Structure 1
């Protein structure tokens, strides 16, 4: 929340974000802007690229392609808002390790 009357947190705005970028600190940026603020474990379907729940994809009606990831909750809220605006931000996933 905002303000010390609500025990709120201090805003790390765009300028401070960009100052952290200028140092090249990728992990510090990830920790400040995802881990300590709005981290959220979510289930994404690998086929249709949409976003599921409880290890289940409500579009494909199957649990075969569900992948658990961690995203900021603001990203999830933005994706649902865009889906409500008839915009489909289908995520595409790739393996982290080249194999």
Structure 2
């Protein structure tokens, strides 16, 4: 959730997010916009993917 009060967490904007691309870090994104924010296991079906 957002800002002070409610509880923590901060913003990575597309304006900022690009930054790490220039450095070239893949693993920092996958840690960042993947593991550390919403890590989630979806069960899909190879045949007729859904």
Calculate the TM-score normalised by the size of structure 2.
Answer: 0.91
Pairwise CA RMSD of aligned residues?
0.8
Higher strand share: 1
Q: Which has the larger radius of gyration?
A: 1
Deviations 1:17-62 (A, max 9, x none): 1001110000001101000101101101000100xxxxxxxxxxxx
Q: Which aligned runs of 4 or more in structure 1 are off by greater than 3 angstroms?
A: none
Distance in 1, matches of 2:41 and 2:29, equals 18
Gapped regions of structure 2 (runs ≥ 5) = none
**How many pairs are equivalent?**
50
Deviations 1:53-97 (A, max 9, x none): xxxxxxxxxxxxxxxxxxxxxxxxxxxxxxxxxxxxxxxxxxxxx
Calculate the TM-score normalised by the size of structure 1.
Answer: 0.49
